[PDB]
Amino acid sequence: GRNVTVEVVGEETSEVAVDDDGTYADLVRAVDLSPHEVTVLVDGRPVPEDQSVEVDRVKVLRLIKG
8 A cells, every 4th residue: 555564574564655666675674674684575475675566568488478
């Protein structure tokens, strides 16, 4: 959304405002950590720091073909 809940595992959970073009890197800096020092996880799977929090474009790839 604009506020995203950020859980620093084993430490504090807080709400962080993120801009429309914000990245996970921005979420990490907002909780006073460095992205190089951490892994960011969305539903238990890691995401790269430079990825946009809001998804505007998706690719769908057929497993078979056509």
